[PDB]
């Protein structure tokens, strides 16, 4: 029937309003935000060429660092930063092809579908070795905004990443299954994280990169030991706020 | 004493969707308080029900959120939308954006039309929903033989039209490779019943905004990832 | 604290028939409603009890669902079926089709005969079931010394004959490499007691349809896969 869209909202009708029909609703709850995001999606990749018992040193190789910034949003080395920082845009890895892979790390599924302005959740991380060679790796988890501590070994032949009280994981041997998984709590000093854009600066002299919020992440993952590892994120107890537009899709 | 165990054949497998949790490595941590927040929503369906813009083609094949009408009654529909959440026509609506991440839908669809012509302009449209089986309606005679509503212009600016869920199956596919009887459900065409009429000093063309969203009994199910593409 | 476990010697083994389930990777999903459906059956035995056609040999060695009878009483049986769910005679009956997927059976077998001759044709048959031990019955004198029923033609068209379950063992094999006392249980032969009799203007040959199925107390057990073959 008639209505007035200028009001800001119109009724949600079913066939019975205008015609001789009945509602046809069937129970369903797979559309709940918590359920939808509570599943692992590829969100990053990591690579290391140094052994376990050595000093961890930030490195890049064909767009792959040996450390990661835990955030579904695009992250990568920004303007020669020591470690990956959150990006404001995505770029192709190749300077020619004009086709993916991208050089930036992110949860494609989150970026392509995040119809909200802010979000809150815990993060379940999964780290998998890309080949079947027996794993031998040490990973260090650093809470959001905490010191990276990229120091020297304090003792000979020991993994420097394990030389911390920070949560760290150590997997090695033919009894293992070449993967690691764990869940970390929301650690940002912010109440909720911006899911897409942050209309502001992060410092008092407004010199930072406009668009990036301060400490908008779940911490970082530093890795040492041989191999390339893919990373998955699973959003636990996911909560979203303020509906907003989805990424535009080219017209068919 | 130790418990005897039978290691299943899938040992070490990482199930991305297992309904179980993993080991907590930094527990007893307080989640930064956010009780002051507003605007939270818990169901993605909420988004699907928000009327969003359809992409109509401009005379120069440009995409616009409306279609034109004037002092005449064409023998063909002003616009034609195939009822599929896959329609290129609704490709950028919130409804389609959400539906792309689900396998099937069910329920009503709301097509909202907002008349933007002058207050002095009058006219009547016949919005029709033709179920499949006999092809697209070729004339007004055929269109009015299916589900339809006559929209008369006046004080109220918009018309909320519902495409009834008429299907051989309880659920319908969100997308498809080739159209099937479970992924394509007919067409919605809007015709000019009477010509748009108006006095002197009024532009001949009126613009009708077009939007879509899921109806009151609309639902989606089965979370999935849509065919990836390169933004541009 | 972690629980001590004793990994059994069969770790990682995939048991195709373990009575346990595995991990669900897409739960909380509704099975498309099908409450409108009819024709559901829950036991395969239902199928075994439906009388299905036996394959008799034509004069040109072709397979037909019946046998012939006329105005004479042969000194030999019109048809002979060895009681084995392996009989080539019942190879394409639903009974045999189901039995092929089970190891053993037990219970009655129903052999249904339907007279298709004219209404003017009369006659009597002696259906006999001869248990093994002394070989196949060579004469009517021998056949009528075992289990038998005399079938008289008339108003009612068919005769439901039951092969009693007479066995040294509680269960019997469905198939075999070589016949044994637990896989072969004798023969069912139908004789012409009195000649088929009729008036002028009636074809000399009458056709009797032949079918089989499990009886009221028939059962099968132990699901298995039968010897594979190439369809043709």
């Amino acid at each position: 029937g008639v209505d007035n869209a200028e009001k800001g909202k119109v009724s949600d009708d079913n066939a019975s309003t205008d015609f001789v029909a009945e509602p046809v609703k069937l129970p369903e709850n797979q559309t709940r935000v918590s359920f939808f995001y509570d599943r692992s999606t590829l969100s990053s990749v990591l690579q290391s060429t140094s052994d376990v018992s050595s000093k961890f040193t930030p490195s890049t190789a064909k767009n792959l660092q040996n450390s990661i910034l835990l955030t579904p949003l695009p992250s990568d080395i920004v303007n020669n930063s020591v470690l990956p920082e959150q990006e404001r845009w995505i770029s192709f890895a190749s300077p020619t092809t004009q086709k993916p892979p991208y050089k930036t790390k992110q949860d494609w599924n989150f970026i392509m579908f995040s119809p909200f302005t802010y979000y809150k959740c815990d993060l379940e991380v999964t780290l998998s070795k890309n080949d079947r060679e027996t794993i031998s790796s040490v990973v260090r988890y650093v809470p959001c905004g905490a010191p990276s501590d990229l120091s020297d070994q304090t003792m000979p032949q020991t993994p420097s990443l394990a030389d911390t009280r920070d949560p760290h994981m150590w997997v090695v041997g033919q009894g293992t299954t070449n993967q690691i998984s764990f869940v970390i709590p929301y650690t940002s000093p912010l109440s909720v994280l911006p899911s897409v854009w942050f209309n502001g600066f992060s410092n008092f002299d407004n010199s930072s990169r406009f668009g990036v919020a301060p400490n908008a992440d779940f911490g970082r993952l530093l890795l040492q030991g041989q191999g390339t590892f893919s990373v998955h994120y699973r959003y636990k107890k996911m909560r979203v706020f303020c509906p907003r537009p989805t990424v535009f899709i080219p017209w068919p | 004493s130790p418990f005897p165990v039978t290691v299943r054949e899938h040992a070490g497998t990482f199930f991305s969707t297992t309904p179980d949790t993993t080991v907590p490595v930094y527990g007893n941590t307080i989640s930064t308080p956010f009780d002051y927040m507003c605007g939270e929503f818990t169901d993605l369906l909420s988004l699907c029900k928000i009327p969003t813009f359809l992409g109509n083609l401009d005379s120069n094949k440009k995409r616009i959120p409306y279609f034109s009408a004037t002092n005449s009654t064409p023998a063909t529909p002003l616009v034609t939308y195939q009822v599929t959440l896959s329609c290129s026509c609704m490709a950028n609506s919130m409804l389609a954006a959400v539906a792309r991440n689900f396998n099937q839908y069910r329920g009503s669809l709301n097509y909202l039309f907002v008349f933007t012509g002058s207050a002095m302009t009058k006219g009547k449209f016949l919005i029709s929903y033709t179920p499949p089986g006999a092809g697209e309606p070729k004339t007004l005679d055929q269109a009015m033989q299916a589900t339809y509503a006559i929209w008369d212009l006046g004080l109220n600016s918009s018309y909320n039209f519902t495409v009834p869920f008429i299907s051989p199956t309880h659920y319908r596919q969100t997308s498809y490779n080739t159209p099937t009887i479970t992924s394509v459900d007919g067409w919605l065409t809007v015709w000019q019943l009477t010509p748009l009429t108006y006095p002197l000093g009024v532009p001949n063309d009126s613009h009708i905004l077009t939007l879509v969203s899921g109806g009151d009994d609309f639902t989606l199910r089965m979370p999935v990832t849509f065919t990836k593409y390169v933004p541009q | 604290s972690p629980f001590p476990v004793t990994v059994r010697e069969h770790a990682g083994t995939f048991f195709s028939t373990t009575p346990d389930t595995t991990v669900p990777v897409y739960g909380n999903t509704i099975s498309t409603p099908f409450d409108y459906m009819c024709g559901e059956f829950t036991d395969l035995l239902s199928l075994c009890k439906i009388p299905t056609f036996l394959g008799n040999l034509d004069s040109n060695k072709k397979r037909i669902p019946y046998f012939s009878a006329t105005n004479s009483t042969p000194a030999t049986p019109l048809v002979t079926y060895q009681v084995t769910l392996s009989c080539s005679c019942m190879a394409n009956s639903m009974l045999a089709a189901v039995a092929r997927n089970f190891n053993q059976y037990r219970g009655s077998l129903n052999y249904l005969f339907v007279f298709t001759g004219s209404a003017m044709t009369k006659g009597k048959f002696l259906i006999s079931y001869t248990p093994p031990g002394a070989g196949e019955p060579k004469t009517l004198d021998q056949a009528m010394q075992a289990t038998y029923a005399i079938w008289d033609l008339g108003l009612n068209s068919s005769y439901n004959f039951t092969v009693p379950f007479i066995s040294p063992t509680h269960y019997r094999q469905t198939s075999y490499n070589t016949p044994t006392i637990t896989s072969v249980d004798g023969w069912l032969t139908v004789w012409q007691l009195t000649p088929l009799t009729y008036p002028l203007g009636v074809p000399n040959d009458s056709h009797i349809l032949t079918l089989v199925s499990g009886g009221d107390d028939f059962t099968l057990r132990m699901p298995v896969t039968f010897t594979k073959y190439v369809p043709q």
Partner: peptide, 24 residues
């Protein structure tokens, strides 16, 4: 959302999950 296990979580709720608290 995606919580389909009968037996309770092996880890405390305060450890398995972030502790939600209101500042008011």
């Amino acid at each position: 959302g995606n919580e389909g296990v009968i037996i309770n979580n092996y880890y405390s709720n305060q450890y398995q999950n972030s502790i939600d608290l209101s500042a008011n």
